[PDB]
Amino acid sequence: PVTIIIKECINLSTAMPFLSGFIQLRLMLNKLKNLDNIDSLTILQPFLLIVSTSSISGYITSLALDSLQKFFTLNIINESSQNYIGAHRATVNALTHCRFEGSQQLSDDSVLLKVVFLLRSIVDSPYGDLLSNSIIYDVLQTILSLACNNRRSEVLRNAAQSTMIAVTVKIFSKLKTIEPVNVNQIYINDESYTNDVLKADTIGTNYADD
Amino acid sequence: SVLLKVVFLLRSIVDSPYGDLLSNSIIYDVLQTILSLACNNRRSEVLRNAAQSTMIAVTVKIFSKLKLPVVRQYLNLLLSLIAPENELKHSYSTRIFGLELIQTALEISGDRLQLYPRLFTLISDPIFKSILFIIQNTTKLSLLQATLQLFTTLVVILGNNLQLQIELTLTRIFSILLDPSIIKELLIEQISILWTRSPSFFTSTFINFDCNLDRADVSINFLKALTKLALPESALTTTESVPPICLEGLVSLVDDMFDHMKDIDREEFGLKKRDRKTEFIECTNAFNEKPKKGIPMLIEKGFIASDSDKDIAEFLFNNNNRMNKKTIGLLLCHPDKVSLLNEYIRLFDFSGLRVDEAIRILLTKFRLPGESQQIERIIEAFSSAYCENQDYDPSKISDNAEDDISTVQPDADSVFILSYSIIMLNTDLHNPQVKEHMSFEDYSGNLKGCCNHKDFPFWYLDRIYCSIRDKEIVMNEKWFEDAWNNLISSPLELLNFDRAIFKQVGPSIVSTLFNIYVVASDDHISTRMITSLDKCSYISAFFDFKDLFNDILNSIAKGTTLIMPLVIPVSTDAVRFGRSFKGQLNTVVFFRIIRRNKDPKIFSKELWLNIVNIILTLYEDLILSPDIFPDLQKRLKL
């Protein structure tokens, strides 16, 4: 379990500054034997800083995002890990603010699907139930922006449609567990219909926190 | 888009709980298609990335159930994917994708794989061939990275029982490392996790790998490679990042052995396997030499009952992997041990065995000697041994029985010419230097009138030729082996155990510690370097190691640089102290060693001559105060 964090820190260290957290982590990770009191927000923080930052190239972001997918799919972040809900809040919040830069190898359109798949895995998993309203709203805004935009390829749009039809199930299934508020008193509508609007695209080349 | 849709439907149906109720044959029919989607390159790249993600997910789902024919067929499919037999048809991308796939599949549930035998049989012989073969025969960096990814996972999770197969792989890395420019950097960078993760990997290796008789020595070899890699001269054949990894390995080793050192009593201390292994590995060097003087040396070690030729002949008989074969062949070639020549081959058994299998077995016993006249006696005893082993029945000789050994009753000349003719087949056919191909019919006709002035049974020679033709060679060092190059087909206690590490390796380690501290200019590396040297100095005190515990402080004393007119205490050899940070740093740790030392007798004569200096010269440059014992001064009223 402790292996898989230092492991792939080998892989993502190979990027020849912004990488200093990785060698700091490698010095931190040698003698633990387990994930007990390591402040689990910090152990994912260098990856979050890599994916959130816009200046650096896209290839390192692709490698980091694949590493993050491999992180979650193992289920290394156990429930017993300290402050895990904060870590998942941080990684979703950093995911929704993703940025990109032009690159010759691969394509940004190729690796946006990794963001979509990782978001789908995050929300669909039980871990997604311990998320706040603002970050999930930002996630839905980002996915809807990806779906609506015509600049990207139609296959990625189809992936966006698929994950949205997937995530309606998860968001509305909690509607069964929740109980009705108030005492069924008479209600007068006084809220707007068009106060909100579709957020403009940002991932590409160029009573809420409860 | 329809391919993406069917992939999403497959992921949803297989990840669902109802996916567990799919049949244990249809999953393979699924997997062939949805993995061929990943392998195919002409499709869009985003579709391939979707294929990689959903293969990772379905691999999690299928291998989580292992806690059943589907996984067997699956490992067969990955074996066909990764292994180099099908390298021509498959591309780099599909191969590496399968490689990280099997890495994930083993890593998720590798602990439980020991119990079930069929998967382990499929993972030992054919799978490990792939990761062994890729290291010598690759150029692209990503594939080597992925293979070392998988190999490090095997060592870190499944290194306990998967024991012998660690040997042949692990040596070969040094053959490419100790002996390509970026490949060495990749190897060193990816191997460090091996020592880092497992907490006491070197001690565990010395426990199971070294002191066991059958296995060779790797940990001592590992340190002997690393210490050579430590010096900056290795930067002429490696990148600047390589020495930091090796220094991290060495400092981690000494820090782990110091973390083992927290609370043990020295008086409480005052091997049961390696004690044999010492003289056992010593006698091979005498046998890998002019070995006449080593034979009476062997008897003195309480190994053999008596100096009779039967006992030494039996001794050379049993062991096959130990003695160097060419040296034993040359020993057998000498003409002054003809008694040993007669009696050693007597203990062979040719009952119910053919001559072809006899020669096939016997060529493995020694390399065929390249001498002209010395082989004439052995290639003759080859024939002469066979007369008494097979009991003679002259009244039961006939050609009616086909594929029969009892029918032939050759004399000495018959088996002599048979053996002399059989040896020529490998040079005639298998060797490539003979460009003119010789027909076998002329070779058989050459043997006219040989079976006691008569022809040998032609069916016998025909079957022997049919046997030997099966191993034709085209175009010798090890060019790999179809049979795996292995015979698989055929707190006080731990300190006591690793007591023997330093007596083998320690001088090399302290030499490694020095010669980089001097050249290194940076403060941060140097303070850690000298702290490591302090750790070795403490470790020397528990044990005896007089040479090490003398030489290390002698080197430090020479390194402190203490051995115009003066006036505050200015001196010719005080400004050198102030200007040199290193001179400041060695004195404090040196006098710390002198402080916490326990035994008085351990120091030597010339060290004592050294430490009367330092303090005398510091007096002579008026640095330290003179009244070191004011109590005796007050007692004398002086």
PDB file of C-alpha atoms in Angstrom, chain A residues 7-200:
ATOM      1  CA  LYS A   7       6.107   4.089  -7.047  1.00  0.00           C
ATOM      2  CA  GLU A   8       5.066   6.246 -10.047  1.00  0.00           C
ATOM      3  CA  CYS A   9       6.764   9.154  -8.283  1.00  0.00           C
ATOM      4  CA  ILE A  10       9.611   7.473 -10.122  1.00  0.00           C
ATOM      5  CA  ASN A  11       7.637   7.815 -13.352  1.00  0.00           C
ATOM      6  CA  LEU A  12       6.377  11.378 -12.950  1.00  0.00           C
ATOM      7  CA  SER A  13       9.734  12.601 -11.626  1.00  0.00           C
ATOM      8  CA  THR A  14      11.111  11.889 -15.110  1.00  0.00           C
ATOM      9  CA  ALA A  15      10.137  15.270 -16.592  1.00  0.00           C
ATOM     10  CA  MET A  16      13.439  16.849 -17.661  1.00  0.00           C
ATOM     11  CA  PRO A  17      10.908  24.587  -9.790  1.00  0.00           C
ATOM     12  CA  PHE A  18       7.438  22.996  -9.825  1.00  0.00           C
ATOM     13  CA  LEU A  19       8.689  19.429  -9.158  1.00  0.00           C
ATOM     14  CA  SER A  20      10.331  20.042  -5.749  1.00  0.00           C
ATOM     15  CA  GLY A  21       7.384  18.549  -3.863  1.00  0.00           C
ATOM     16  CA  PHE A  22       8.066  15.185  -5.499  1.00  0.00           C
ATOM     17  CA  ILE A  23      11.621  14.847  -4.175  1.00  0.00           C
ATOM     18  CA  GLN A  24      10.367  16.201  -0.838  1.00  0.00           C
ATOM     19  CA  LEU A  25       7.736  13.441  -0.846  1.00  0.00           C
ATOM     20  CA  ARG A  26      10.335  10.824  -1.809  1.00  0.00           C
ATOM     21  CA  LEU A  27      12.383  11.871   1.215  1.00  0.00           C
ATOM     22  CA  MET A  28       9.198  11.813   3.331  1.00  0.00           C
ATOM     23  CA  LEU A  29       7.955   8.384   2.155  1.00  0.00           C
ATOM     24  CA  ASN A  30      10.958   6.117   2.811  1.00  0.00           C
ATOM     25  CA  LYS A  31      10.298   5.025   6.445  1.00  0.00           C
ATOM     26  CA  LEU A  32       6.572   4.832   7.221  1.00  0.00           C
ATOM     27  CA  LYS A  33       5.479   1.179   6.587  1.00  0.00           C
ATOM     28  CA  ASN A  34       1.827   2.395   6.361  1.00  0.00           C
ATOM     29  CA  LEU A  35      -0.438   5.428   5.884  1.00  0.00           C
ATOM     30  CA  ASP A  36      -1.188   6.382   9.499  1.00  0.00           C
ATOM     31  CA  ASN A  37      -0.457  10.052  10.404  1.00  0.00           C
ATOM     32  CA  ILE A  38       0.871  11.460   7.123  1.00  0.00           C
ATOM     33  CA  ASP A  39      -1.691  14.275   6.521  1.00  0.00           C
ATOM     34  CA  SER A  40      -3.189  12.701   3.401  1.00  0.00           C
ATOM     35  CA  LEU A  41      -4.008  16.045   1.769  1.00  0.00           C
ATOM     36  CA  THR A  42      -0.259  16.641   1.435  1.00  0.00           C
ATOM     37  CA  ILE A  43       0.509  13.266  -0.156  1.00  0.00           C
ATOM     38  CA  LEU A  44      -1.684  14.170  -3.188  1.00  0.00           C
ATOM     39  CA  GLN A  45      -0.860  17.908  -3.199  1.00  0.00           C
ATOM     40  CA  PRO A  46       2.030  17.845  -5.755  1.00  0.00           C
ATOM     41  CA  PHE A  47      -0.187  16.036  -8.279  1.00  0.00           C
ATOM     42  CA  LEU A  48      -2.926  18.606  -7.683  1.00  0.00           C
ATOM     43  CA  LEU A  49      -0.479  21.463  -8.203  1.00  0.00           C
ATOM     44  CA  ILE A  50       0.757  19.827 -11.415  1.00  0.00           C
ATOM     45  CA  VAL A  51      -2.698  19.283 -12.910  1.00  0.00           C
ATOM     46  CA  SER A  52      -4.086  22.650 -11.768  1.00  0.00           C
ATOM     47  CA  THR A  53      -1.193  24.754 -13.080  1.00  0.00           C
ATOM     48  CA  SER A  54      -1.692  26.068 -16.619  1.00  0.00           C
ATOM     49  CA  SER A  55       1.850  27.110 -17.567  1.00  0.00           C
ATOM     50  CA  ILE A  56       3.488  23.671 -17.716  1.00  0.00           C
ATOM     51  CA  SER A  57       3.140  21.413 -20.741  1.00  0.00           C
ATOM     52  CA  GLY A  58       0.361  18.896 -21.330  1.00  0.00           C
ATOM     53  CA  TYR A  59       2.423  15.694 -21.382  1.00  0.00           C
ATOM     54  CA  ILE A  60       3.346  15.928 -17.693  1.00  0.00           C
ATOM     55  CA  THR A  61      -0.320  16.600 -16.920  1.00  0.00           C
ATOM     56  CA  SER A  62      -1.312  13.476 -18.855  1.00  0.00           C
ATOM     57  CA  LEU A  63       1.199  11.352 -16.945  1.00  0.00           C
ATOM     58  CA  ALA A  64       0.065  12.819 -13.611  1.00  0.00           C
ATOM     59  CA  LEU A  65      -3.600  12.246 -14.432  1.00  0.00           C
ATOM     60  CA  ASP A  66      -2.951   8.636 -15.437  1.00  0.00           C
ATOM     61  CA  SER A  67      -1.083   8.237 -12.148  1.00  0.00           C
ATOM     62  CA  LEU A  68      -4.088   9.681 -10.294  1.00  0.00           C
ATOM     63  CA  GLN A  69      -6.429   7.242 -12.045  1.00  0.00           C
ATOM     64  CA  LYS A  70      -4.104   4.411 -11.008  1.00  0.00           C
ATOM     65  CA  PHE A  71      -4.137   5.867  -7.483  1.00  0.00           C
ATOM     66  CA  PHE A  72      -7.904   5.734  -7.140  1.00  0.00           C
ATOM     67  CA  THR A  73      -8.514   2.434  -8.967  1.00  0.00           C
ATOM     68  CA  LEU A  74      -6.357   0.605  -6.403  1.00  0.00           C
ATOM     69  CA  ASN A  75      -8.311   2.194  -3.508  1.00  0.00           C
ATOM     70  CA  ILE A  76      -5.150   3.149  -1.641  1.00  0.00           C
ATOM     71  CA  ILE A  77      -6.843   6.059   0.178  1.00  0.00           C
ATOM     72  CA  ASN A  78      -8.689   3.991   2.773  1.00  0.00           C
ATOM     73  CA  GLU A  79     -11.399   5.297   5.080  1.00  0.00           C
ATOM     74  CA  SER A  80      -8.926   5.040   7.973  1.00  0.00           C
ATOM     75  CA  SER A  81      -6.616   7.577   6.290  1.00  0.00           C
ATOM     76  CA  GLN A  82      -6.636  10.878   8.154  1.00  0.00           C
ATOM     77  CA  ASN A  83      -8.552  13.776   6.578  1.00  0.00           C
ATOM     78  CA  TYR A  84      -9.450  11.774   3.470  1.00  0.00           C
ATOM     79  CA  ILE A  85     -12.615  13.815   2.864  1.00  0.00           C
ATOM     80  CA  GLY A  86     -10.452  16.926   2.664  1.00  0.00           C
ATOM     81  CA  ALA A  87      -8.182  15.177   0.171  1.00  0.00           C
ATOM     82  CA  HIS A  88     -11.100  14.226  -2.075  1.00  0.00           C
ATOM     83  CA  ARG A  89     -12.523  17.744  -1.789  1.00  0.00           C
ATOM     84  CA  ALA A  90      -9.129  19.113  -2.830  1.00  0.00           C
ATOM     85  CA  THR A  91      -8.663  16.760  -5.776  1.00  0.00           C
ATOM     86  CA  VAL A  92     -12.149  17.404  -7.193  1.00  0.00           C
ATOM     87  CA  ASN A  93     -11.676  21.164  -6.708  1.00  0.00           C
ATOM     88  CA  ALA A  94      -8.325  21.032  -8.512  1.00  0.00           C
ATOM     89  CA  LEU A  95      -9.775  18.830 -11.265  1.00  0.00           C
ATOM     90  CA  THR A  96     -12.529  21.299 -12.142  1.00  0.00           C
ATOM     91  CA  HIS A  97      -9.955  24.133 -12.561  1.00  0.00           C
ATOM     92  CA  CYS A  98      -7.903  22.161 -15.106  1.00  0.00           C
ATOM     93  CA  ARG A  99      -5.919  24.028 -17.776  1.00  0.00           C
ATOM     94  CA  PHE A 100      -3.833  22.990 -20.778  1.00  0.00           C
ATOM     95  CA  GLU A 101      -1.069  24.057 -23.150  1.00  0.00           C
ATOM     96  CA  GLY A 102      -0.283  23.054 -26.708  1.00  0.00           C
ATOM     97  CA  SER A 103       1.822  19.966 -27.345  1.00  0.00           C
ATOM     98  CA  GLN A 104       2.936  17.957 -30.365  1.00  0.00           C
ATOM     99  CA  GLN A 105       2.892  14.474 -28.832  1.00  0.00           C
ATOM    100  CA  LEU A 106      -0.611  13.156 -28.101  1.00  0.00           C
ATOM    101  CA  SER A 107      -3.601  15.527 -28.042  1.00  0.00           C
ATOM    102  CA  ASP A 108      -5.339  17.512 -25.311  1.00  0.00           C
ATOM    103  CA  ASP A 109      -8.617  16.192 -26.729  1.00  0.00           C
ATOM    104  CA  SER A 110      -7.271  12.691 -26.089  1.00  0.00           C
ATOM    105  CA  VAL A 111      -6.545  13.317 -22.396  1.00  0.00           C
ATOM    106  CA  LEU A 112      -9.661  15.321 -21.530  1.00  0.00           C
ATOM    107  CA  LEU A 113     -11.350  11.907 -21.571  1.00  0.00           C
ATOM    108  CA  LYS A 114      -9.088  10.932 -18.667  1.00  0.00           C
ATOM    109  CA  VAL A 115     -10.471  13.878 -16.669  1.00  0.00           C
ATOM    110  CA  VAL A 116     -14.024  12.841 -17.548  1.00  0.00           C
ATOM    111  CA  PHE A 117     -13.443   9.189 -16.621  1.00  0.00           C
ATOM    112  CA  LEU A 118     -11.744  10.068 -13.333  1.00  0.00           C
ATOM    113  CA  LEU A 119     -14.607  12.426 -12.448  1.00  0.00           C
ATOM    114  CA  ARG A 120     -17.126   9.687 -13.263  1.00  0.00           C
ATOM    115  CA  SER A 121     -15.241   7.229 -11.057  1.00  0.00           C
ATOM    116  CA  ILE A 122     -15.049   9.801  -8.246  1.00  0.00           C
ATOM    117  CA  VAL A 123     -18.748  10.670  -8.249  1.00  0.00           C
ATOM    118  CA  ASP A 124     -20.069   7.146  -8.861  1.00  0.00           C
ATOM    119  CA  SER A 125     -17.928   5.667  -6.078  1.00  0.00           C
ATOM    120  CA  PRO A 126     -19.124   5.885  -2.443  1.00  0.00           C
ATOM    121  CA  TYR A 127     -16.366   8.466  -1.832  1.00  0.00           C
ATOM    122  CA  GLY A 128     -18.401  10.906  -3.937  1.00  0.00           C
ATOM    123  CA  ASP A 129     -21.105  10.937  -1.261  1.00  0.00           C
ATOM    124  CA  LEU A 130     -18.715  12.903   1.027  1.00  0.00           C
ATOM    125  CA  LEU A 131     -18.413  15.884  -1.353  1.00  0.00           C
ATOM    126  CA  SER A 132     -19.698  19.442  -0.912  1.00  0.00           C
ATOM    127  CA  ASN A 133     -22.289  21.167  -3.081  1.00  0.00           C
ATOM    128  CA  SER A 134     -20.002  23.767  -4.670  1.00  0.00           C
ATOM    129  CA  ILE A 135     -17.409  21.335  -6.027  1.00  0.00           C
ATOM    130  CA  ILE A 136     -20.009  18.980  -7.516  1.00  0.00           C
ATOM    131  CA  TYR A 137     -21.779  21.968  -9.081  1.00  0.00           C
ATOM    132  CA  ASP A 138     -18.463  23.025 -10.617  1.00  0.00           C
ATOM    133  CA  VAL A 139     -17.952  19.442 -11.834  1.00  0.00           C
ATOM    134  CA  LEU A 140     -21.358  19.405 -13.525  1.00  0.00           C
ATOM    135  CA  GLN A 141     -20.664  22.829 -15.037  1.00  0.00           C
ATOM    136  CA  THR A 142     -17.352  21.600 -16.465  1.00  0.00           C
ATOM    137  CA  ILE A 143     -18.898  18.435 -17.911  1.00  0.00           C
ATOM    138  CA  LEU A 144     -21.779  20.396 -19.452  1.00  0.00           C
ATOM    139  CA  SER A 145     -19.293  22.867 -20.940  1.00  0.00           C
ATOM    140  CA  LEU A 146     -17.362  19.950 -22.442  1.00  0.00           C
ATOM    141  CA  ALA A 147     -20.566  18.469 -23.873  1.00  0.00           C
ATOM    142  CA  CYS A 148     -21.891  21.719 -25.351  1.00  0.00           C
ATOM    143  CA  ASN A 149     -18.661  22.894 -27.003  1.00  0.00           C
ATOM    144  CA  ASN A 150     -18.382  22.033 -30.708  1.00  0.00           C
ATOM    145  CA  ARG A 151     -14.644  22.771 -31.056  1.00  0.00           C
ATOM    146  CA  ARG A 152     -13.703  19.406 -29.550  1.00  0.00           C
ATOM    147  CA  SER A 153     -14.201  16.116 -31.365  1.00  0.00           C
ATOM    148  CA  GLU A 154     -17.637  14.508 -31.394  1.00  0.00           C
ATOM    149  CA  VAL A 155     -16.346  11.337 -29.711  1.00  0.00           C
ATOM    150  CA  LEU A 156     -15.337  13.293 -26.600  1.00  0.00           C
ATOM    151  CA  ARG A 157     -18.757  14.953 -26.714  1.00  0.00           C
ATOM    152  CA  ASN A 158     -20.316  11.477 -26.742  1.00  0.00           C
ATOM    153  CA  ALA A 159     -18.214  10.598 -23.696  1.00  0.00           C
ATOM    154  CA  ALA A 160     -19.509  13.770 -22.020  1.00  0.00           C
ATOM    155  CA  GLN A 161     -23.104  12.764 -22.777  1.00  0.00           C
ATOM    156  CA  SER A 162     -22.461   9.272 -21.407  1.00  0.00           C
ATOM    157  CA  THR A 163     -20.980  10.490 -18.127  1.00  0.00           C
ATOM    158  CA  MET A 164     -23.782  13.021 -17.620  1.00  0.00           C
ATOM    159  CA  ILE A 165     -26.449  10.347 -18.122  1.00  0.00           C
ATOM    160  CA  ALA A 166     -24.409   8.266 -15.668  1.00  0.00           C
ATOM    161  CA  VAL A 167     -24.182  11.012 -13.032  1.00  0.00           C
ATOM    162  CA  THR A 168     -27.897  11.902 -13.077  1.00  0.00           C
ATOM    163  CA  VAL A 169     -28.406   8.480 -11.468  1.00  0.00           C
ATOM    164  CA  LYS A 170     -25.965   9.205  -8.651  1.00  0.00           C
ATOM    165  CA  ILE A 171     -27.123  12.763  -7.926  1.00  0.00           C
ATOM    166  CA  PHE A 172     -30.852  11.904  -7.966  1.00  0.00           C
ATOM    167  CA  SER A 173     -30.519   8.583  -6.099  1.00  0.00           C
ATOM    168  CA  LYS A 174     -29.702  10.570  -2.953  1.00  0.00           C
ATOM    169  CA  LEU A 175     -33.173  12.120  -3.360  1.00  0.00           C
ATOM    170  CA  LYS A 176     -34.599   8.890  -1.909  1.00  0.00           C
ATOM    171  CA  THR A 177     -32.482   9.032   1.255  1.00  0.00           C
ATOM    172  CA  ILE A 178     -33.149  12.716   1.971  1.00  0.00           C
ATOM    173  CA  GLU A 179     -36.396  13.593   3.801  1.00  0.00           C
ATOM    174  CA  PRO A 180     -38.764  16.481   2.951  1.00  0.00           C
ATOM    175  CA  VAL A 181     -37.966  19.824   4.544  1.00  0.00           C
ATOM    176  CA  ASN A 182     -40.497  22.107   6.262  1.00  0.00           C
ATOM    177  CA  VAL A 183     -43.972  20.995   7.427  1.00  0.00           C
ATOM    178  CA  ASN A 184     -45.677  21.192   4.005  1.00  0.00           C
ATOM    179  CA  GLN A 185     -46.551  24.846   4.578  1.00  0.00           C
ATOM    180  CA  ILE A 186     -47.925  26.976   1.750  1.00  0.00           C
ATOM    181  CA  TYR A 187     -45.126  28.216  -0.520  1.00  0.00           C
ATOM    182  CA  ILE A 188     -44.895  31.413  -2.593  1.00  0.00           C
ATOM    183  CA  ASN A 189     -42.428  31.453  -5.478  1.00  0.00           C
ATOM    184  CA  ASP A 190     -39.910  34.309  -5.272  1.00  0.00           C
ATOM    185  CA  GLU A 191     -36.761  32.799  -6.877  1.00  0.00           C
ATOM    186  CA  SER A 192     -35.301  33.482 -10.306  1.00  0.00           C
ATOM    187  CA  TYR A 193     -35.528  31.171 -13.316  1.00  0.00           C
ATOM    188  CA  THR A 194     -32.512  32.557 -15.250  1.00  0.00           C
ATOM    189  CA  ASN A 195     -30.127  33.797 -12.545  1.00  0.00           C
ATOM    190  CA  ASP A 196     -27.574  31.107 -13.481  1.00  0.00           C
ATOM    191  CA  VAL A 197     -26.093  30.435 -16.920  1.00  0.00           C
ATOM    192  CA  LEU A 198     -23.799  27.921 -18.607  1.00  0.00           C
ATOM    193  CA  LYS A 199     -20.181  28.489 -17.606  1.00  0.00           C
ATOM    194  CA  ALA A 200     -17.832  29.254 -20.480  1.00  0.00           C
TER     195      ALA A 200
END
